[PDB]
Design a protein around this ligand. Structure first.
Ligand SMILES: *[C@@H]1O[C@H](CO)[C@@H](O)[C@H](O)[C@H]1NC(C)=O
Length: 245
């Protein structure tokens, strides 16, 4: 059954291929043709095994990792992707990254997705704001999942993207690294514009900065009061504490 049956030699990727058997797709469908017209696959209602064949073709064609040409239109092939394979990928455009993450909506960060992001960010060089926006959209609890030392490398610019709900899972050792960045990030912003944004990062704020906030008529919430460093609220006086209330 090596040869493709006469007449079934597919010149184009189309809906006819759903009728084909596993070996027929392995015989008839050329890999080079599939790679070019990979944008059609998500349209065609293929079966489980049929996709495995299409996936196998790409490995044969691209032993050294797929190009971004193909990656963009992977779709539900991404689900059947090996972790080592993704390490080869050189993804750059964020529109690529969105499409991949949109196949695993709702679910937890799969091994594949985890390996994709680490490779993505290495390629960029730094964790961008635009990067964070997309990551936090699909996976809110990302920043807290990063190890404290990795957060040190994170530029102050990216803190714009972070939201109050994103830091819920963060332990205080992470907030100690994020606070000075947030402080550098939200600079030149006088008044309540300072306060409203820093609310969250106060969880890792020294005592010297708490005395500064007291005298600027902030009127801090009492919910925020509770989420402060126990060690770094000892030098601060009750007089100073009263000015935050
Ligand atoms: C990624 O880029 C490196 C350096 O240009 C190259 O050696 C490698 O083959 C690329 N990986 C891909 C796109 O398969």
């Amino acid at each position: 059954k090596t040869a493709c049956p006469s007449g079934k030699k597919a010149r184009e990727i189309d809906e006819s291929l759903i009728f084909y058997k596993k070996w027929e797709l392995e015989a008839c469908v050329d890999a080079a043709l599939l790679a070019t017209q990979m944008d059609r696959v998500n349209a065609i209602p293929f079966t489980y095994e049929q996709l495995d064949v299409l996936k196998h073709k790409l490995d044969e064609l691209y032993p050294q990792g797929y190009p971004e040409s193909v990656i963009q239109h992977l779709g539900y092939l991404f689900l059947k992707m090996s972790p080592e394979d993704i390490r080869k990928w050189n993804v750059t455009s964020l529109e690529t990254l969105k499409a991949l993450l949109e196949v695993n909506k709702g679910h937890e960060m799969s091994p594949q997705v985890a390996t994709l992001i680490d490779r993505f960010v290495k390629g960029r060089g730094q964790l961008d704001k635009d990067t964070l926006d997309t990551l936090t959209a699909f996976y809110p609890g990302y920043l807290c999942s990063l190890s404290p030392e990795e957060l040190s490398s994170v530029p102050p610019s990216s803190i714009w993207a972070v939201r109050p709900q994103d830091l819920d899972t963060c332990d205080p050792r992470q907030l100690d690294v994020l606070y000075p960045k947030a402080r550098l990030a939200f600079q030149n912003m006088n008044g309540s514009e300072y306060f409203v944004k820093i609310q969250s990062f106060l969880g890792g704020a020294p005592t010297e900065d708490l005395k500064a906030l007291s005298q600027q008529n902030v009127s801090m919430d009492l919910a925020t009061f509770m989420k402060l460093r126990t060690d770094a609220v000892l030098p601060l006086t009750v007089a100073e504490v009263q000015k935050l209330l």
